[PDB]
Amino acid sequence: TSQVRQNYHQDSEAAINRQINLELYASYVYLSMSYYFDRDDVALKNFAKYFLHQSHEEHEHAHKLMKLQNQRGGRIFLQDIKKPDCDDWESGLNAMECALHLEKNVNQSLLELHKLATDKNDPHLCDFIETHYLNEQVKAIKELGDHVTNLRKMGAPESGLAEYLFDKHTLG
Template sequence: GELISKFGERQTLQNFHTDCIAKINTQINSELTSAYVYLSMASFLRQDNVALLGFAKYFSQAFTEEIEHAEKFIQYLSTRGGQLQLSAIAAPAKHEWESIEQILADALSMEKHLNQELLALHACASSHGDAHLSDFLDANYLQEQVQAIKQLADLITIVKRLGCACVYILNRDMMNGVYSSHGK
């Protein structure tokens, strides 16, 4: 037999609108950008002048989860016959923070932004009658995103209310796995 020299048409592409494919590619970039930010946060928290290793562990887990989210979207594109179009990942805007409260606030803001993008993607799926994409988002992302936002908001409230002493306790609890990123 002769080797096939050209790839044929994608055979799995069905009811997968180009607008939704573009938004998924944007979401992949956002997940990877968020992973970079979480990696930067974890690294900062490991510095000897900060030494909050429990929080560093928490944000390292968040880094891994964002990478997994991007990979899941990439696999989904492949399953549905969409084309992956990677774009440049922006460097984090910050590499240092003034306080753990500021880090948590930045993480909360980022998670809210990711949630808005997921909701826009869900709306795109609905407007194009793509029940499969809607179900995929419901099953894999939307609830977890709400839980992540709630957990970060709770942590901010605890730190604001109780101050430095609670940072030590939260750091210890995170080191021991009491808290994990994305509310799991």
């Protein structure tokens, strides 16, 4: 056992590894979206920039989880990062909706992780989750919901002008 390990349950360690994989997968999905909007037949540059920034943030989250795993004496076990569900995201609105769904899935995973940590009486893990992930997820979900609402009201995806103007004014 690790010399620094204290009040760190094996189930918590396994759940942390699963969360690391999930964050990496989310980063990969965002990368796919970003370079979808970089295509010459899509050409929505600020959508691409937004999703690239999201990918970078997801990577940062994964990094922080790995650092936590090392801090508590757990051992990182990396797994395959599955490819995203789609290659063609079909519109800015569809990409935003998919991102909202992904963020809610990540939030649900984090909530299950917090429940596990509470059941295992690991207050440090609970505080780590609350401080670094829960509010970030809530803010991200709210922002994506706002984006989806605005895109729908402007007339997307049928109205290409709507997505162009949202690209310029909101994401620009």
